[PDB]
Design a protein around this ligand. Structure first.
Ligand SMILES: *[C@@H]1O[C@H](CO)[C@@H](O)[C@H](O)[C@H]1NC(C)=O
Length: 319
């Protein structure tokens, strides 16, 4: 029994984990990442982003993305492919370009087509557009929004669907897990894509939460159902629950209940297909370098030992 067996027993497609290429040289890490009792699905943390896959214009590079796919293939795990259009981790040629609408669109479409076609048949889902919203629900002023306007979003989805018509296409974002302007604006992106006549299959809720300040099971579920009502599926795509350090037994127990609610909200909502944690061990979490004074966010500690949050997750999944 483990997270992925329990998830599947409740009708979810998977419980999964992100990873990154340098971690695949750690034997012990790879052994646990490869334990399909716990993980039925993998997301590449960095090697399918634009700077990795198209470091110069029309010059694609897939070796590192492929290495993650190969590991999922060896294990029989599903892949989520992450991410086509995003304002972060762009190569210099995109950011520094003197663009027109026509020339940026051409570059964006060529990016999407190339990368999606390369991974055709290999991915459960793609995060097609990531983080397009500001917290108030207005559109983020990325290069894509400044040059192309809002149509970049549906154009991106239509391009992806043309290159691989079977893969689930997701809009992915953070702070759209709880009721508010940003979640309403995420519902509105789903509606906009469909009004354009483009395909969207899923909403990805990143779920980067904080211990003792995580949305309640009730509000998480209201929000999930807000998206599933629209005829899309949903998933928690980058779950982690960062704690203000130092770690204590009380914070670890809080963290357990916070993870428990997330799993339980997913099981509660028909059309929630899965949960991915953003890596699985505190040793390799992205959190401490970005969020000063915060850490210990995942269900295993830095020594690869289960924390109480593992049992929270199991409880939330009814195991
Ligand atoms: C860019 O071109 C597209 C496709 O023709 C169009 O939908 C969109 O409105 C244009 N945007 C701008 C800012 O001109």
């Amino acid at each position: 029994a483990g997270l992925n067996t329990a998830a599947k027993a409740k009708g979810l497609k998977y419980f999964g984990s992100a990873t990154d290429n340098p971690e695949l040289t750690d034997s012990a890490y790879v052994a646990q990442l490869s334990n399909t009792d716990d993980f039925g699905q993998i997301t590449p943390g960095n090697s399918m982003k634009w700077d990795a896959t198209e470091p110069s214009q029309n010059s694609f590079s897939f070796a590192n993305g492929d290495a993650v796919v190969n590991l999922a293939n060896k294990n029989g795990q599903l892949m989520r492919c992450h991410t086509l259009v995003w304002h972060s981790q762009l190569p210099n040629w995109v950011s520094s370009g003197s663009w027109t609408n026509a020339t940026l669109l051409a570059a964006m479409k060529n990016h999407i087509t190339n990368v999606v076609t390369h991974y055709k048949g290999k991915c459960y889902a793609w995060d097609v557009v990531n983080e397009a919203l500001n917290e108030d629900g207005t559109f983020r002023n990325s290069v894509f929004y400044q040059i192309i306007g809002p149509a970049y979003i549906p154009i991106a989805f239509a391009t992806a669907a043309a290159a691989d018509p079977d893969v689930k296409l997701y809009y992915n974002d953070y702070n759209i897990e709880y009721s508010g302007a940003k979640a309403t604006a995420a519902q509105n992106i789903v509606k906009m894509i469909k009004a354009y006549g483009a395909k969207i299959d899923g909403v990805g809720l990143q779920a980067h939460f904080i211990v003792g300040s995580t949305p309640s099971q009730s509000d998480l579920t209201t929000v999930l159902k807000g998206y599933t009502a629209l005829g899309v599926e949903v998933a928690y795509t980058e779950l982690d629950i960062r704690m203000q350090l130092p770690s204590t037994a009380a914070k670890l127990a809080q963290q357990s209940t916070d993870f428990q609610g997330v799993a339980a909200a997913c099981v509660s909502t028909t059309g929630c297909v899965g949960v991915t944690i953003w890596d699985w061990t505190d040793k390799y979490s992205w959190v401490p370098s970005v969020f000063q004074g915060y850490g210990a966010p995942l269900p295993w500690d830095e020594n690869y030992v289960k924390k109480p949050a593992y049992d929270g997750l199991m409880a939330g999944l009814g195991a």
